[PDB]
């Protein structure tokens, strides 16, 4: 039931608390970063491609 | 470990008694890295010993160690279907380790309300060659003497 879920999320929420974040790239509801509007999967995928400016593997 | 013996890190002397042994005792009594509490217990207990006795507490503690530090230990050896203990001489480093471990462990089990009182009493008893810590040493020697037939191992 993905497309309908993606569409319904796009529309304004009837009540403020009901608005939630999905991955804009794939629609995943869980583990969506606010800075990037991406889930952990797409984030890791695109960070590898070098298409998320400023992000690189962290080591210390 | 398999490679071989490792480096043993040195301990600095006690600030007021100028004894490494006192520092080692403080570490044994220490819990959760709370050395301030550990040091207070040891220094209070050496002041209790300075009161119940007119002698230098460091002297009393060293006499307690002489009566508690074991000389022969039993080293479990598994031979075939029979596992028996083999008497072993205790190297000097482990001697103080066992002495400190036994004195502290049995002080924690004493009946007095505060640890420094419990530690001072346990120290003084050992200095007189009596108490639980001395009994642990007596049993350890008793076990080795019984298994003295396996000395050749």
């Amino acid at each position: 039931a993905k497309k309908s879920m993606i569409a319904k999320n796009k529309r304004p929420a009837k009540h403020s608390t009901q608005a939630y974040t999905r991955c804009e790239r794939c629609g995943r509801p869980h583990s969506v970063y606010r800075k990037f509007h991406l889930c952990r999967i797409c984030f890791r995928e695109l960070a590898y491609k070098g298409q998320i400016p400023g992000v690189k593997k962290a080591s210390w | 470990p398999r490679k071989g013996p490792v480096a043993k890190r040195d301990v600095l002397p006690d600030p007021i008694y100028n004894s490494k042994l006192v520092t080692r005792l403080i570490n044994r009594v220490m819990v959760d890295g709370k050395r301030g509490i550990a040091a207070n217990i040891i220094y209070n207990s050496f002041d209790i010993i300075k009161e119940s006795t007119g002698n230098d507490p460091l002297e009393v503690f060293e006499q307690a160690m002489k009566n508690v530090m074991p000389v022969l230990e039993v080293k479990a050896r598994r031979v075939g279907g029979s596992n028996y203990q083999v008497p072993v001489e205790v190297r000097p480093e482990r001697r103080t380790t066992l002495g400190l471990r036994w004195v502290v462990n049995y002080a924690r089990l004493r009946g007095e309300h505060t640890m420094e009182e419990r530690l001072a009493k346990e120290i003084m008893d050992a200095a007189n060659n009596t108490g639980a810590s001395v009994k642990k040493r007596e049993d350890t020697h008793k076990m080795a003497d019984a298994n003295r037939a396996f000395a050749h191992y």
Binding site: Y33, F43, V55 | -
Partner: protein
């Protein structure tokens, strides 16, 4: 004039910072800096797998390098000189 520069890479940041100093200094103004400011860091930890396997993670970081330029007793030419100079898209710049 106070100029704050921010970029994800310090190599371009130094190049652009030098251009601000070189143009601003050459036009008669006297400049302070560039002053290194603490580089910001943000850490993101994501589960490496798509399903279960919680123990395996990957660490990503974003480092924001930043510099400060203070132009003192600026000449009239500074206002246009520090605006004709166009910086690379990666280097952010705020004036005053």
């Amino acid at each position: 004039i106070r100029i704050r520069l921010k970029a994800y890479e310090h190599r371009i940041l130094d190049q652009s910072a030098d251009k601000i100093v070189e143009t601003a200094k050459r036009t008669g103004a006297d400049v302070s800096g560039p002053i290194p400011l603490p580089t910001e860091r943000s850490l993101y930890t994501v589960i490496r797998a798509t399903h279960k396997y919680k123990d395996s993670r990957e660490q990503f970081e974003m480092r924001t390098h930043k510099r400060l330029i203070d132009i003192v007793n600026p000449t009239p030419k500074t206002v246009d000189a520090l605006m004709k100079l166009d910086l690379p898209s990666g280097v952010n710049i705020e004036i005053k």
